[PDB]
Amino acid sequence: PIPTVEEKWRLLPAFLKVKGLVKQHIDSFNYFINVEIKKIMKANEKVTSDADPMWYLKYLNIYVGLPDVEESFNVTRPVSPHECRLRDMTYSAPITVDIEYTRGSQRIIRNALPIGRMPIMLRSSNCVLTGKTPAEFAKLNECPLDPGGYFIVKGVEKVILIQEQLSKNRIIVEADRKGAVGASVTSSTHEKKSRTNMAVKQGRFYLRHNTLSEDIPIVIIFKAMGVESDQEIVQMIGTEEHVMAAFGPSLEECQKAQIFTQMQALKYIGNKVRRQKTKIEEARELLASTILTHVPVKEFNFRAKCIYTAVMVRRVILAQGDNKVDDRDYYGNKRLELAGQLLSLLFEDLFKKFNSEMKKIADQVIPKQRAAQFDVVKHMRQDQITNGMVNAISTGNWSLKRFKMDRQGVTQVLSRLSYISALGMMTRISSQFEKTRKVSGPRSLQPSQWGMLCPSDTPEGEACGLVKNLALMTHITTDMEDGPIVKLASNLGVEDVNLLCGEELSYPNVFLVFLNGNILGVIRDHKKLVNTFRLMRRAGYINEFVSISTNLTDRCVYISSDGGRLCRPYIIVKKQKPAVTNKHMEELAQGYRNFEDFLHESLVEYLDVNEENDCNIALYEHTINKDTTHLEIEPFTLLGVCAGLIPYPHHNQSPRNTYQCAMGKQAMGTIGYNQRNRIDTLMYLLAYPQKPMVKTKTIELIEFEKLPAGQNATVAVMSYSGYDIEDALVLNKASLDRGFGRCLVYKNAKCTLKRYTNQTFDKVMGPMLDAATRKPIWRHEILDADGICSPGEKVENKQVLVNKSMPTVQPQYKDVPITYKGATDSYIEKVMISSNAEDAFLIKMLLRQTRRPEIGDKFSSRHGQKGVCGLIVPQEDMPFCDSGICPDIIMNPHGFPSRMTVGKLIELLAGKAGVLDGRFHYGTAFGGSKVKDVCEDLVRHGYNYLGKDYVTSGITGEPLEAYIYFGPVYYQKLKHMVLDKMHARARGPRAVLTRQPTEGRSRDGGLRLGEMERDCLIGYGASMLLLERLMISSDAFEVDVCGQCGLLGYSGWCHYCKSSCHVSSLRIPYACKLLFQELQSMNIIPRLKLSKYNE
Amino acid sequence: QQPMIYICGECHTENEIKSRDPIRCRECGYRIMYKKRTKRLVVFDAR
C-alpha cells in the first residue's frame, strides 16, 4: 500500500477558473491590444515628406476605447451586442491616437484624433460584457452561459479557427527520391522569409536558394564568408576520420577552381548570382543578411554564420550513411497560430498602407500651393481601415502583399445548432495541409500528442485527421523576451563562441546551447546547467513558460521561449513522493492556496512536448517509481469536450467513439437562455429536455445538465415482428402522442429596403380589397393594414409575406412581393422593424413550425448508434413485464456484436439502478462505478441483479421464453428529417444557356445521371431506355442539315450552297448542337456526312 | 384610419407611426420597435 491522495481532482476546476477552455482566445486578444498595438506603433512612428525637410509627423500614444456607435449626428451612446446582432450592425470601437503635425512654422499637437474603428471581442476587457452578474446579464438580453470568443460583423457570428504551422529558425534533415537533404527556413521580425537547402549528390555538397541561379559548393561560400585557410574549414566541420573522407571531394573541387582569395570567391558568387554597385558588393550584401536573416551580424563578421553552417554540415554528414531522419509530424516543433498574430499582421499592413498613402497625397500640393498653412486633418479619411478590417473578417481571405501571402477559409460562421456545437467550434483546429489523398502520416494518430489533442474527436469523411480539437487541460504560451534568460545563461558560465576554435565543438564532452534557433555558445556539465535552470524557473525569477531540453544524439541543449507552444500543468514528485499533500489541498478546499500560490510555492509546473521527452511521468500513484519526475493529475483529462458525453469511453470502441463525437454536435436541443429573442436563419428547439441519469464529471465541468439536448426513455433490447433491421428502430404510438420527441423549427425572413442616389424611393401597397366584400384578397390574406403580416397567424404555401414595390427606372413600379415557399403551413411568431447603419428599413420575421417524430427520422443512442425509424407501434402491443411498463423504443440485439459496444449495457444498468435508488451515478472515463457494487444494490429493491425481467408477450398473450433487457437510456434526436429530405420534379424551370433542369431542390430541380449508372445500363445491354432518359426526357431538339455540305440551316434552306433539294432533319440533343455552334468560334467547322440508314 | 400601435423593447410604450418619420421611441432612445398581436379568430387543434 502507498499513501494516496484522492483530492487532486479539485485542482482542475481551480485551473480552469483562471484560464483554459475558451479564455485563451480572449487572452490572445487582450495581450494583443495592450502590447502588439503599441509594438506596431513604435515600429512606424515618424514619417517625413520629400519636397522640403520641414514637415514631419509624430505619434505620441495609441489606444482603443469602448464599443460605440455613431448615429445621426454627434451622438455616441454605448451599444449592446444583442442590439448589433438584431440590427445586423458590426461590434466595433474607435481607435484614439495622439498625433503631432508641424504646419506652417509652428508645431501642432492635436490630442484625441480618431483614425478608424476596430472590432472588439464579445467577452473582452474593453467590452461591456465583463465582470457583470447574471441578473445584469439578463438585463442586456444575453446568455450568461455563452462562452464567447467570436466576432460580430454584419449581424453574424464569425470564429477564427486556430491554424497549425511548422516552426521557423530551425534545421530540418529530410529524405527524398535521391537521398538526404537539409533545409533551413528563416523569418525575422521584418518582412523577409527565406528557405535555403543543402543537397548532396555524388559526394558533393551544394547550396540552393530562391535568389540563386545555379548551385555553389559550400567550400566556396566558406572562403567567401571570411575563413581563408582551408584547414580551419575542415576543423570546424568535424575532427573525425570518416567525416574527413566524405569532405575530400569538396576540398579537391575547391582546389581545382582558381579560387584562393576572398575577392575571387566574391567575384565567383557575383558571376553566379543573378538579380533583376559592382559584383563584389552585391555578392557581399547577398551573404550578409539575405540568405539567413535569423542570424544577425554586428558589422561584417560572418563568424556566427560560419559556425551555424558548420553545424549544419556536420548534421547532414551524420545523417547521411545512417537510418535517422527528421519527420514533420512531430508536434514538439509544430506551432499554433491564434487570431492574434493574424490581426497583428493585418493591422501592421493597414497602418503602413495608411502612412504611405497620405505621404503621397501631400507631396504634390506643397509645391503647387495657394496658401501658407496646410492642415493634415482635413486631408484624412477613417473609412479605409474600417472597411478593410470588416471585409477581411467577413470574407475571410487574408491577402497581404507586403508579406506576400494569401490564405482562404480562416473565419467560419459560428454554428448555433446546439450548446455543444457552439463550444466545440471554439476548440476546433485546422491544418495548413490541403485535401491530399496521398498524405497519411499527419492524418494518422501520432504518439507525440498525449493529452493535448483528443484522439477520438475527429470528423468522419474526407477530413480524417486534418481537423483536430484541443484537450481539457491545454495552454498556449504567449510571447516574451530573452534578455534576463541570456543574462542568467552568461552568469551561469556559458562560454562565448568567438573564443574557442573549430576543433573544440567536435569534442564529445563539449555541448552547444541553442535558444530559439540561435547558437548561444559552448558549455560543459550540461546536467548541472539544466538542474540550475529548472531550479531558477521553479523559484520565480524567470517566467514559468520557458522550455529547456537536451539531446544526446546531437549533443546540444535546446532552449525554447517563443510564443505558441503547448503546455499542461504537471504535479512534481520528490524522489519517492508527490509534493502535494492533504494539508495543501485542504486549504484549497477552504478557499486559499489557489493555483497561483501552488505555482509560486514550487508544487506544480508546466512542461512542453519536447520537455516531457526528457522526463519520466507516472499515470497513477501506485505506479510511481524512483525514476519518475512528474505525475499525472487526472487521467480522464485526455478526452475532449465532445468525447466527455460518452458513458464509459474505454468500454466503447474508437470508431463508435468518433461517431458519437461527430453526432454530438448534430443533435438538436436548447441553445441558451435567450433563444426566443435572438433571430437566426435556422434554429432547432426541443419540447421537454430531460436530464442524463448517468452523467460525467466533464458534463458538470461545462454545466451541460442545464441545457441538455436529449431525453431519457425506456428501452427493451429484443427482436420485434419485422422492423428491427440492422439500424431500424421502432417507436411507441402512445408515447409519441404523449409527446416524446417533440421538436420545433424556426426560420428567419429578413427584408431590407433603402433609398437611391435620386429622389426615387420605395413603398408598400398593403391589403387589397375586392368589390364584393370588405375582406382582403386570397393573395394578400395575412397582410395587415400597414403592409406587413401580423404575428400569431398561419401562412400556407404560396402566400405573400411583405409587399415590395420597386421603381422600374410618376415612375412605374414593379411589384416583387416576397412569397413563402414551403410544403407544410408555418406560423408567425413576431415581427421586428428597425433601421440599419445605412439608414435603411429592415423587417425581420420569425416563422415557427412544430413537428412530431414519424417514420423516416434519424435517432441516436449517444453511443455511436444511429438509426432510422421503423413502424409506429401502438399501445395494444409493446408487452409489459410485471408492473405494466411498455417499452418506449425497442432496440435490436443483432447490431451489438458488430459495433462491439459494451458501454451501452452498463449505461442501461447504471441508469436503472439510479432511477430506482434516486441518485445520479458517475460514469467518467478511467473510473466511475463498477458493476459489483451496483449489482448488489439492485437486489435490495427486489428486481433481478443484472438485467433480466420476466416478460409476457402482448400480441399472442403468452409468456416469453427468454428474458428481455429492460432499462432507461438517454436518447437524442438529430436533424435530416424525412420531410426535408424529400423532393420530386417533373416539369419546372430550366437554364437559358443549356436547356436542362437546374441544380438544387430549392429551385425545383431534378437529379443527375452520371456515367457511374450509365455503365450499369450498358452492361445489361438496354439501349432504348438509355436514350429515352438521356435524350427524350433531358433535351430533344429538331435540327435541319444539308447532305452536300454539312451545316446548320433554317426552315429547310441552306445559305452556303443556295439549294433546297439537299435537306434533311434529325433529332439532336440541345447540348450537342450547343457544342457544335460553340466550337465554330475556334476556327473549326464540323462538317457532318449524312448516310442512308434505310439502304 | 386608426393609428398603427407599436410597442418598444426597452420601455414598452404604445406609440404610433404617422408617415415616413424617423422610426424611434418618444419616451426612451431605443431605435427598435415591435408589433402587437392580431385581433382575429385563429383555430387550433388539441390532438
Binding site: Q759, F761, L769, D770, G787 | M4
Partner: peptide, 10 residues
C-alpha cells in the same frame, strides 16, 4: 417619399 397604409379597390 414613403407611402404606406394603401387600400386599392377593384
Amino acid at each position: 417619399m414613403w407611402y404606406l397604409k394603401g387600400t386599392v379597390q377593384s
